[PDB]
Write an enzyme that holds these catalytic residues in place. Structure first.
Site, PDB file in Angstrom:
ATOM      1  CD  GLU A   5      -9.414  -3.888  -2.808  1.00 16.53           C
ATOM      2  OE1 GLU A   5      -8.695  -4.225  -1.847  1.00 16.53           O
ATOM      3  OE2 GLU A   5     -10.355  -4.593  -3.221  1.00 16.53           O
ATOM      4  CG  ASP A  41      -8.668  -0.657  -6.428  1.00 14.11           C
ATOM      5  OD1 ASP A  41      -7.690  -0.390  -5.702  1.00 14.11           O
ATOM      6  OD2 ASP A  41      -8.998  -1.828  -6.697  1.00 14.11           O
ATOM      7  CG  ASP A  95     -12.182  -4.796  -9.807  1.00 12.72           C
ATOM      8  OD1 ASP A  95     -11.096  -5.247 -10.233  1.00 12.72           O
ATOM      9  OD2 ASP A  95     -12.290  -4.133  -8.748  1.00 12.72           O
ATOM     10  CG  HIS A 146     -10.809  -8.557  -4.757  1.00 12.75           C
ATOM     11  ND1 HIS A 146      -9.554  -8.072  -4.454  1.00 12.75           N
ATOM     12  CD2 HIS A 146     -10.613  -9.657  -5.520  1.00 12.75           C
ATOM     13  CE1 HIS A 146      -8.640  -8.843  -5.012  1.00 12.75           C
ATOM     14  NE2 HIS A 146      -9.256  -9.813  -5.665  1.00 12.75           N
ATOM     15  CG  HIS A 154      -7.162  -5.006 -11.015  1.00 13.62           C
ATOM     16  ND1 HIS A 154      -6.769  -4.219  -9.953  1.00 13.62           N
ATOM     17  CD2 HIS A 154      -6.171  -5.911 -11.195  1.00 13.62           C
ATOM     18  CE1 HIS A 154      -5.594  -4.632  -9.511  1.00 13.62           C
ATOM     19  NE2 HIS A 154      -5.209  -5.657 -10.247  1.00 13.62           N
ATOM     20  CG  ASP A 211      -5.588  -1.696  -7.539  1.00 11.35           C
ATOM     21  OD1 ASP A 211      -5.979  -1.134  -8.586  1.00 11.35           O
ATOM     22  OD2 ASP A 211      -6.089  -2.762  -7.121  1.00 11.35           O
ATOM     23  CG  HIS A 222     -13.484  -2.063  -5.927  1.00 10.77           C
ATOM     24  ND1 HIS A 222     -12.781  -1.538  -6.989  1.00 10.77           N
ATOM     25  CD2 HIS A 222     -14.535  -1.235  -5.726  1.00 10.77           C
ATOM     26  CE1 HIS A 222     -13.378  -0.437  -7.410  1.00 10.77           C
ATOM     27  NE2 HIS A 222     -14.445  -0.230  -6.660  1.00 10.77           N
ATOM     28  CG  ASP A 247      -9.535  -1.264 -10.270  1.00  7.74           C
ATOM     29  OD1 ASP A 247      -8.380  -1.725 -10.209  1.00  7.74           O
ATOM     30  OD2 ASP A 247     -10.509  -1.802  -9.697  1.00  7.74           O
TER      31      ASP A 247
HETATM   32 MN   LIG Z   1     -10.862  -2.715  -7.674  1.00 13.48          MN
HETATM   33 MN   LIG Z   2      -7.628  -2.955  -8.438  1.00 13.09          MN
END
Ligand SMILES: [Mn+2]
Ligand SMILES: [Mn+2]
Ligand SMILES: [Mn+2]
Ligand SMILES: [Mn+2]
Ligand SMILES: [Mn+2]
Ligand SMILES: [Mn+2]
Lengths: 308, 308, 308
Positions: B272, B227, B123, B136, B121, B229, B96, B119
């Site tokens: 990702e 993302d 980030d 990332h 996260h 994830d 990312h 996401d």
């Molecule tokens: Mn990400």
């Molecule tokens: Mn992530």
């Protein structure tokens, strides 16, 4: 009002053998004995003995027409009888093409019945639009009046009388509809709650809208045709056409608990359980147990509990 | 508006396996052939060749500063390019960190765009708060205008020009935010829907509020940085930083379907996807097919069905 | 507001493997360390040593009375003492029979407390209604004032005085209730949100109603008794009585996060973790890591993030 268990071990409506084993798999779980535990009296009609049709060549792209038509003509007669006898019919079957006989038989007795179709699919392709020629993907096509005459006469289905109107059916769980089917449900104004509306509204409002739409004007018999693939592969893996992002085990139960509460359930179908398609024995156990749970849910078993 | 598929095999953003096969993994899955089947036109720009910076020694803690910020330039120039040609950019890459290039270049052409970042996260770690040094997990930090002047310039990121404010981005899916990041999102007043908010409101209300927040005033180009994830590991297993309790497959599709419905999607990232992090063969496929499904959804494919 | 971990390695409340190992497993997963990382000061009282009573034969159908009664007597005194000092007690135990002593002890210092019971079971069977005689399925029967006198006094429980009113407890997650139990919650008008109510309302509304009902007219201390089997078996497999269709990982965290936000949590039970029931060592880790996460959530750990 008692219950009439009817087994329909049939698979000619689809290519994946194994679905004819569904009834035995469900009975194996003690479905009938568990149903008797409810406040309903239960009777097991046993399975039907469908006999194949000799030279049953494909009619255009449609396969096993006469055999699928014959098997279904027999179920219609069977379900019609039980319906006339004031009992609730419960069909455990092979593939969903059997909804033709089940619904037809049911509609002969109760012409005002409404249908709630829980499936990942619309099964509304016709002998002309179908891209596979498999009859378990065309049942609603032979049942809908608005589609009558919109496709050539199919060998073995001369006995079918279009019994339900596009306005009398509600779809829940849709997420794998072909181009032809989508055109149809769209141009016909059929009510549906695809997985998109379920995510948007929540299963609670969905059932509220389903009942207001079907039982709004007046009350009438409910026919619930349940395709186990309507639920996520995580819960009902042993089935022919699994699709991700489906209904949860919980939403499946909620649907049935709400249908139970209406006190209008008249006909029920538990279809597409294929015990030969479990990657492990446990995926079958999971599919069978989910199917049994929903069936009992349709008849009173509630998650908050039950007592006499 | 035609679509422009841009490859981005870059993994200097993170150590875990090799997220460069991602672009090549999504293609094999037939991502291009399926996108053309939609109502858009499609052209594949091919995968960018990232020149590796020589003695690119880490910056204090951040690793591969020059190398990362260089790969993003080529991409950023490639994106701005397509953005000018009146095309929707769809970057298929690795880590990312590449959102830096995709977004910067997109904002160069459309500086009034907003961002929807799906996401687990944020980030948004600055080169000084970060606890790993991997880029990332810092893209939003090199993109926010309020973060400029909060951390030492990084070797190879001089070109970057803060293109987004703190009220132009909406986070959806949060569930693993480091202390440093959480302070920033809170101090800057960043708009976000962590899993807590998704559980509370339901994904349906989450999108209503997102659009109202970002588009309530004026309508503008939407940039979706996805993302994988962000979805629960049970759905997107093949990824570097899996976190339990994520968005479901259905919620993921809801997001994309609603965004397609705005008719404002101008930029997209599907990051990702590391096909080398799939315990078993079907965990990579499952991840890849979900990534493809999320992309098609973005461009019109709906679960209720489609037809010409 | 300090925290004191209290170990309750007991299992005589039920049959199954070794739930006495529950506390060791949670500390193994670093629950103490992670707790000291929050904004609370933590202390571990260690595990209590329970004295196994001699000729402790069955009282009617009830198994190990004198053992379960005395043990709970020990815990009550210990929890009463910690509560006395102004600390929040966290009881990591074996089976759920230990909530009798956990809640009894707690009520001595906070007699106006309320209880939120997260479980797939009501655990309110009396010695006369119980179909197993296992006391981990009868704890609430000993605690409710409305049920005192409705069953015979049990050997080893005379030290117990009903502390909670049928109107001071709310159930969340119910989906496996016995006929006797269901009759009791219905007759005694106990507030509960079975999986049906959660599917209907969404977990967000469930907590809003839970709090209005409990903290609507008067603010008071909260005791959370959390049976890990309240969550679906896919998350907490290593438990003695798993039941499908449970609360999700996300919903369990929402519950704890919301309870934390009230600022009234005063007592907590993390029960039924059996690290020997795990079909695989990981199913144990998964159950253990999930219980640890819920504990941390009860003390401020939020999915949106945390900073000093
Ligand atoms: Mn990400
Ligand atoms: Mn992530
Ligand atoms: Mn079907
Ligand atoms: Mn189907
Ligand atoms: Mn319990
Ligand atoms: Mn329990």
């Amino acid at each position: 009002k008692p219950i009439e268990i009817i087994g329909a071990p049939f698979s000619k409506g689809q290519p994946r053998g194994g679905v004819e084993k569904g009834p035995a798999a469900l009975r194996k779980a003690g479905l009938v004995e568990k149903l008797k535990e409810t406040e309903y009296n239960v009777r097991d009609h046993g399975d039907l003995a469908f006999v194949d049709v000799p030279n049953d060549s494909p009619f255009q792209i449609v396969k096993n027409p006469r055999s699928v038509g014959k098997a279904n003509e027999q179920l219609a007669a069977v379900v019609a009888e039980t319906q006339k006898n004031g009992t609730i019919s419960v069909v455990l079957g092979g593939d969903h093409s059997m909804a033709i006989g089940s619904i037809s038989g049911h509609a002969r007795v109760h012409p005002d019945l409404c249908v709630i179709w829980v499936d990942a699919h619309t099964d509304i392709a016709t002998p002309l639009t179908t891209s596979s020629g498999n009859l378990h993907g065309q049942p609603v096509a032979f049942l809908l009046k608005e589609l009558k005459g919109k496709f050539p006469d199919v060998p073995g289905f001369s006995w079918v009388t279009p019994c339900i109107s596009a306005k009398d059916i509600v779809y829940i769980g849709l997420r794998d509809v072909d181009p032809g089917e989508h055109y149809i449900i769209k141009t016909l104004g059929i009510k549906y709650f695809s997985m998109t509306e379920v995510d948007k509204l929540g299963i609670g409002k969905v059932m509220e809208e389903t009942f207001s739409y079907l039982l709004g004007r007046k009350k009438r018999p409910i026919h619930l045709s349940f395709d186990v693939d309507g639920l996520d592969p995580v819960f009902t893996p042993a089935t022919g056409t699994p699709v991700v992002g489906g209904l949860s085990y919980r939403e499946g139960l909620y649907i049935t608990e709400e249908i139970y509460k209406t006190g209008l359930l008249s006909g029920l179908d538990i279809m597409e359980v294929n015990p030969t398609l479990g990657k492990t024995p446990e995926e079958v156990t999971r599919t069978v147990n989910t199917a049994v749970a929903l069936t009992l849910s349709c008849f009173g078993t509630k998650r908050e509990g039950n007592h006499k």
